[PDB]
């Protein structure tokens, strides 16, 4: 994986040796070249993962996450170069360096052959994220947003560390390729119970779990746009990725200890969608929608069936693209009206017709319109959870009601109705912003033609 780590590292001289005005263009061009290079990870096989070295490998699970991760960086560079137009050149290079460093930590988080290197990169992704949120945020509450984001996560993960080191003393290796073949049944005891809780609660925090989700409506509305894109797009999927790596070790104790977490997620996807029905803040509405969607991935991992894992990985990739597009649309309003109030700028289809088309398409992919990979992941999770218990379709179907009722209401409040009279700085849509919308949406529509590359290790 060293043909992706070295160009990402070499983006640091490419952003610190550039001209004082060329630094967005150079980093955009070379991050797009790395994103085009990211398709060489698709040498996958039906039995054996693409195993590079002792340090790095990539199956069909980490490969769509890597393609999405290396694709997100040019999109974050395009989104972040408007509010950083008056910024100091040194601080501008610092922001681009934090984006590059976070990309590096993510692309060698998903490719960790050994699980403590996964933990080190998985908790190394906090630091550039924390610096981005607390430094280039906008409001007063970004500082508290750096605390709840941090001290929830470590509260989940500093147990996990200990549990991982226990396996290092017990099995002798945290290699995932060894632990496929040395895995032992984890019986019913209190020691193994808290072993399970230590292995799972860190990723329960970063999904987020309902009840533990309280960091996320604070961390999305207080970050800049590149921070919100990297949280909703990638940094919520470290939890699902880590769960799919770590529940191999946790059997058969998953089949009786994961009951309350399934209950929490099946009720939290109802509760956070209900919260999305009453959010006065647009960016908060997208944050609570992200909690509502990741609850399905939590349920699909905790029932551990093949249809559930395929739906969960399709839903993770689809939600990454869709939530990144919705935060960029909220940014496109926020850069003109300078307020995140959803009721403030109304009737914007009269003023921005093509941007209202992009809002329409992003809201249709939020409500899982077929044949999008949103609907493919949603549908496969609903199939597997109907197989799990026949009653859960109620909690699925009711959710699929409310998931529409905030996807279009967010459309009807911001884009439809009579336009707000006392707002007149609604500029036409920039080519940067429309390019950003199309680079989010056009891969999300092209993956409908070929979904088999985003359906996990067990397609």
């Amino acid at each position: 994986m060293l043909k992706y780590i070295i160009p990402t590292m070499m983006l640091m001289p490419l952003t610190w040796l550039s001209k004082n005005s060329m630094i967005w263009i150079n980093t955009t061009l070379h991050s797009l070249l790395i994103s085009l290079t990211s398709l060489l990870l698709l040498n996958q096989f039906g039995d054996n993962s693409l195993n590079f070295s002792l340090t790095f490998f990539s199956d069909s699970l980490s490969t769509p996450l890597l393609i999405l991760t290396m694709w997100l960086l040019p999109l974050m560079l395009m989104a972040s170069q408007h509010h950083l137009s008056k910024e100091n050149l040194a601080r501008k290079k610092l922001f681009i360096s934090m984006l590059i460093l976070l990309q590096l930590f993510l692309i060698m988080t998903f490719t960790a052959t050994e699980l403590i290197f996964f933990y080190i990169m998985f908790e190394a992704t906090l630091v550039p994220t924390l610096i981005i949120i607390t430094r280039w945020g906008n409001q007063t509450e970004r500082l508290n947003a750096g605390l709840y984001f941090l001290f929830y996560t470590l509260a989940g993960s500093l147990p996990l560390l200990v549990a991982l080191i226990y396996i290092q003393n017990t099995m002798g290796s945290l290699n995932f390729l060894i632990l496929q073949y040395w895995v032992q049944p984890m019986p019913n005891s209190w020691s193994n119970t808290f072993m399970w809780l230590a292995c799972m609660m860190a990723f329960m925090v970063k999904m987020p779990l309902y009840g533990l989700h309280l960091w996320l409506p604070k961390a999305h509305v207080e970050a800049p746009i590149a921070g919100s894109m990297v949280l909703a797009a990638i940094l919520l999927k470290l939890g699902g990725y880590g769960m799919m790596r770590i529940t191999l070790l946790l059997n058969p104790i998953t089949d009786f200890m994961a009951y309350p977490f399934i209950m929490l997620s099946l009720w939290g996807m109802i509760m956070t969608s209900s919260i999305c029905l009453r959010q006065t803040d647009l960016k908060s509405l997208i944050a609570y929608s992200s909690v509502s969607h990741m609850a399905l991935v939590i349920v699909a991992i905790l029932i551990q069936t093949p249809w559930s894992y395929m739906g969960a990985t399709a839903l993770m990739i689809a939600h990454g693209l869709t939530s990144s597009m919705l935060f960029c649309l909220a940014n496109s309003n926020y850069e003109r009206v300078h307020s995140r109030t959803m009721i403030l700028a109304r009737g914007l289809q009269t003023l921005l017709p093509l941007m209202a088309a992009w809002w329409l398409l992003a809201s249709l992919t939020n409500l899982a319109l077929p044949p999008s990979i949103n609907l493919i992941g949603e549908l496969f999770v609903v199939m597997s959870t109907f197989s799990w218990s026949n009653i859960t379709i109620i909690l699925m179907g009711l959710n699929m009601v409310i998931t529409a009722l905030y996807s279009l209401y967010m459309l009807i409040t911001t884009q439809r109705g009579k336009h707000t009279h006392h707002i007149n700085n609604i500029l036409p849509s920039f080519t940067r912003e429309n390019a950003l919308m199309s680079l989010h949406m056009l891969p999300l529509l092209l993956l409908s033609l070929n979904p088999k590359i985003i359906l996990g290790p067990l397609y």
């Binding site: 002792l54 340090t55 052959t113 050994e114 403590i116 290197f117 290092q168 945290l174």
Partner: protein, 171 residues
């Protein structure tokens, strides 16, 4: 533990040299010269055995030969010796230097009538060799078997197997 083994009281009875300390110190150089051999056999047995219960017969030889010394003084030169140890016995620190004329009379009478030379300065402090027939004590400290030591380091130092093996570090 075990019973301590003490000799009986009749094993410790011997004709003691029943004289005072100034009688001894006044005759001390001639006693160190003439009674050399059983005294050195005894002090050899006393430092080699490191047990007074294994040194009783040499102590009886010492207590016999000292009496033979004082008898051989008593047969010939009892009165110059008596006046000399009386002069030595007067002083509190028992100085030899206060009583050199009685020392000269005692040394002259001893040299004439017995043929004894007083040892000069330095001679009685010598370390002398002793010809005894008793064996060397093979275990004077009554020790036991020392524990076997740990096995040492040997063999050619090969490089480490697969590096450090610290969680993921391949070197």
């Amino acid at each position: 533990p075990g019973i301590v083994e003490l000799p009986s009281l009749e094993d410790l009875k011997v004709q003691e040299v029943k004289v005072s300390s100034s009688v001894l110190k006044a005759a001390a150089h001639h006693y160190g010269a003439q009674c050399d051999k059983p005294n050195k056999e005894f002090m050899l047995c006393r430092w080699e055995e490191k047990d007074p219960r294994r040194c009783l017969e040499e102590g009886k030889l010492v207590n016999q030969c000292a009496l033979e010394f004082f008898r051989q003084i008593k047969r010939h030169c009892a009165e110059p010796f008596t006046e000399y140890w009386t002069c030595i016995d007067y002083s509190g620190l028992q100085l030899f230097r206060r009583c050199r004329k009685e020392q000269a009379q005692f040394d002259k009478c001893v040299l004439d009538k017995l043929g004894w030379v007083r040892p000069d300065l330095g001679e009685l402090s010598k370390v002398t060799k002793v010809k005894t027939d008793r064996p060397l004590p093979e275990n004077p400290y009554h020790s036991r078997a020392r524990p076997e030591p740990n096995p040492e380091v040997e063999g050619d130092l090969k490089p480490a197997r697969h590096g450090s093996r610290l969680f993921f570090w391949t070197m």
